[PDB]
């Protein structure tokens, strides 16, 4: 159980995520110590909101550290889908937090009343965005995007509460506007994660499939091709399965090798081709 | 765009889900009309909570109606994973609503003050639990479970607020207890959905795989078996891929037929077997 911490410290991304989680927890302790007093009306709410943020960060870190685990009998493909699941859960969490921020803005507009804790949170999340930057093999592409979207959403929420404080020297309007903005921002990541989880044909492979089918159909001995299935595994590993109907005397070796080469030139890493010998 | 409503009315499950969504929206209208007054402190919060419930119900209905769509070029396997995604999102939504209910209980305990609207919601959700009961092909197994878990969680929340009302003639304790209870209740569905989305070996197939491998290894001409991959598609369709190394003169037809029969007897519906002829 102790070796998990050292394994986390091995990778730089896990180290940055752990440092971020630790500093968020320290901020949680500071804000709850400040809120022990009677002015905790919105302090409890924003404390629970940043608890949700810490939970999302912990989930992302757990998925990132899990994704490097070796495969076994239970998980033939390994744990490379953990990053996709982390991206999906981060998108859903961002949507739900946008709706929660809209609800909190509505509550603040309805009920008149926190002014300096938001500044500290803005400092924390600007430090976070300063730390985080991006610009089978290599199964780490979505954790950075998810954490970046979450931290930018937190920064925009801090900007919105700062604007509300400036206004009081309407907050629901800016709150709902920023919620819609972050929802639109997270739409592409959510749709990409859904497409990955849908067993959908990879977007970068859809155009090349007709050309590959035409090329393999022209192979000598191949009669018919049927039951194609292509999907992404983690980020780029496209696991494609094919069924071929060849001549009763067709050379299976050459056809299999040519099909494998054709689909490897298209970017399909793992490929499974079944060659069926037609009856007359 | 109009034909979607008739398509929903075609299936009984979609009809029940649509009726439930319509009655939840009617309850939303009634409660907001009641809350237009100055006693909307907790009314806005529970209105947003049941808006979240309506959103989850709409997502479940959309996934259920999508899952019956035919496959195409973009989605080779179709939309049968929509039910698994709906189950996963319902589990995450239930967890987040449990945490939200805990937060609301904390707020109610901290801030002293809604007594009859909860009774109406209890009537609505008991009618819902009365309506809902359960006890490639057939791609509908998780929507009913997800909606049943959500409606039972709503009933338990109504029971908790009723208990709090009885107490006032501690509510945070019962709120957190019921939140933990519903989280534990939703753990099995969440873990099953994660296992489906993890490309994990199906739980009902794990035990039979060693026996199938031993049986296929005993086939004449088969030298080595490598790179096994089995996973569930929607609920029972197990898409398995296999690679075989056979003798240079082994009969590919008989080996392929025997492997297909062996894996079909184990419950693998769609199977892809690649036969490789070893060099000497």
């Amino acid at each position, epitope marked *: 159980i102790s070796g998990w911490f050292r394994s986390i410290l091995s990778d730089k991304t896990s180290r940055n995520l752990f440092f971020f989680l630790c500093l968020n927890l320290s901020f949680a302790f500071v804000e709850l110590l400040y809120g022990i007093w009677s002015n905790c009306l919105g302090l409890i709410s924003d404390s629970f909101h940043m608890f949700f943020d810490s939970t999302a960060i912990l989930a992302g870190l757990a998925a990132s550290v899990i994704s490097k685990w070796r495969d076994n009998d239970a998980f033939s493909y390994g744990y490379v889908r953990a990053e996709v699941l982390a991206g999906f859960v981060n998108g859903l969490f961002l949507i739900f937090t946008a709706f929660f921020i809209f609800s909190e803005g509505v509550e603040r507009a309805l009920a008149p009343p926190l002014l300096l804790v938001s500044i500290l949170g803005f400092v924390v999340n600007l430090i976070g965005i300063f730390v985080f930057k991006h610009g089978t093999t290599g199964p780490s592409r979505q954790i950075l995007q998810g954490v970046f979207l979450h931290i930018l959403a937190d920064t925009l929420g801090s900007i919105g509460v700062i604007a509300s404080a400036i206004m009081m020297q309407a907050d629901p309007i800016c709150s709902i506007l920023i919620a819609i903005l972050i929802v639109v921002s997270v739409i592409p990541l959510l749709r990409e994660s859904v497409g990955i989880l849908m067993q959908r044909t990879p977007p970068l492979l859809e155009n090349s499939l007709p050309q590959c089918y035409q090329r393999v159909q*022209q192979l000598q001995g191949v009669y018919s091709l049927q039951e194609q299935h292509f999907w992404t595994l983690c980020s780029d590993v496209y696991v494609g399965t094919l069924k071929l109907i060849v001549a009763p005397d067709a050379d299976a070796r*050459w056809i299999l090798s040519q099909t494998h080469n054709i689909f490897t030139q298209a970017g399909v890493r793992q490929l499974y081709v079944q060659i069926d010998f037609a009856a007359m | 765009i109009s034909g979607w409503f008739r398509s929903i009315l075609s299936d009984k499950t979609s009809r029940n889900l649509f009726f439930f969504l319509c009655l939840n929206l009617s309850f939303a209208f009634v409660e907001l009309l009641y809350g237009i007054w100055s006693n909307c402190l907790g009314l806005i919060s529970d209105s947003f909570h049941m808006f979240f419930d309506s959103t989850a119900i709409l997502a479940g209905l959309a996934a259920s109606v999508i899952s019956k769509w035919r496959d195409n070029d973009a989605f080779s396997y179709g939309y049968v994973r929509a039910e698994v995604l709906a189950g996963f999102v319902n589990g995450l939504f239930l967890i987040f609503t449990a945490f939200f209910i805990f937060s609301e209980g904390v707020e109610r305990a901290l801030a002293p003050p809604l007594l009859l609207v909860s009774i109406l919601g209890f009537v609505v959700n008991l009618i819902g639990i009365f309506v809902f009961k359960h006890g490639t092909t057939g791609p509908s197994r998780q929507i009913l479970q997800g909606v049943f878990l959500h409606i039972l969680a709503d009933t338990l929340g109504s029971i908790g607020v009723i208990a709090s009302a009885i107490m006032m003639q501690a509510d945070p304790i019962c709120s957190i207890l019921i939140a933990i209870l519903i989280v534990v209740s939703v753990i099995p569905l969440l873990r099953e959905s994660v296992g489906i989305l993890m490309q994990r070996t199906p739980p009902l197939l794990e035990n039979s795989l060693p026996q199938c491998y031993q049986r296929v290894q005993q086939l004449q001409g088969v030298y080595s078996l490598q790179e096994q991959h089995f996973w569930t598609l929607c609920s029972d369709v197990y898409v398995g891929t296999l690679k075989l190394i056979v003798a240079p003169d082994a009969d590919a037809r008989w080996i392929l037929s025997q492997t297909h029969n062996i894996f079909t007897q184990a419950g693998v519906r769609q199977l892809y077997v690649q036969i490789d002829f070893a060099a000497m």
Partner: antibody, heavy 118, light 112 residues
Framework: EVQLQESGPGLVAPSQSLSITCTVS????????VHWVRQSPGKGLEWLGV???????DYNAAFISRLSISKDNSKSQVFFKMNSLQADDTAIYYCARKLAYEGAMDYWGQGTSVTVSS | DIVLTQSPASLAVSLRRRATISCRAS??????????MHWYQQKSGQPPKLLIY???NLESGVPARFSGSGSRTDFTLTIDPVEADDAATYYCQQSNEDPYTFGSGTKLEIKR
């Protein structure tokens, strides 16, 4: 006792059509492929085309425009037709049975000397 | 097209000696560890006869004296021992890439 015999005209006028019928025996065309290879003193051996079990055929890139290979499984005969012959098309035309599940040809037949001249 | 070059063009080998014919391909013809190069023997006034398929497997019904190795681009057909009946023209043929191409023939002359 597998045999392949061709029956084609020895002399063909230039810019005419060549018809060669390769009658097979000892095996059925329903499960085997027959290749067509011509040999000339110049350019050496050259591959023309092949016809598969039910009728699918693949032609050489050079001759794809002016080639046509037919087959009739009932009479166990393979029809070979070329259009617009020239001087360099004079060669020895062989019909060869494709090896069992291999890219080579195992059994051949004594080709017919096709000479293109006026 | 894949051009196949056979060296030497003409070879003179004494009886009961060892004969080596090498076929070189412009491009690699290996597919997943399988070499798709085949050897043919054509005597005087006879159709070519298949000897070795896939560059390492003897066709059924040929004498065991014929041996063949090679991989990728360079291949080699070995006759040991060489008999008087082995005086013919040998062709190397590849089936890796459409169209099939036959290399220039190599004439084997028996020294006596």
């Amino acid at each position: 006792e597998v045999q392949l015999q061709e029956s084609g005209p020895g002399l063909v006028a230039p810019s005419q059509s060549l018809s060669i019928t390769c009658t097979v025996s000892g095996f059925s065309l329903t499960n085997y492929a027959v290749h067509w290879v011509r040999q000339s003193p110049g350019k050496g051996l050259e591959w023309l085309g092949v016809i598969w079990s039910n009728g699918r055929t693949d032609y050489n890139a050079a001759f794809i425009s002016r080639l046509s290979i037919s087959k009739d499984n009932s009479k166990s005969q393979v029809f070979f037709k070329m259009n617009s012959l020239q001087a360099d098309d004079t060669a020895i035309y062989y019909c060869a049975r494709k090896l069992a599940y291999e890219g080579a040809m195992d059994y051949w037949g004594q080709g017919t000397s096709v000479t293109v001249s006026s | 097209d894949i051009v196949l070059t056979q060296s030497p063009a003409s070879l003179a080998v004494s009886l009961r000696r060892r004969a080596t014919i090498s076929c070189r391909a412009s491009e690699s013809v290996d597919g997943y560890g399988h070499s798709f190069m085949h050897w043919y023997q054509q005597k005087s006034g006879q159709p070519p006869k298949l000897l070795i398929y896939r560059a390492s497997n003897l066709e059924s019904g040929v004498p065991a004296r014929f041996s063949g190795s090679g991989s990728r681009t360079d291949f080699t057909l070995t006759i040991d021992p060489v008999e008087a009946d082995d005086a013919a023209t040998y062709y190397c043929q590849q089936s890796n890439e459409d169209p099939y191409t036959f290399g220039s023939g190599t004439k084997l002359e028996i020294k006596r």
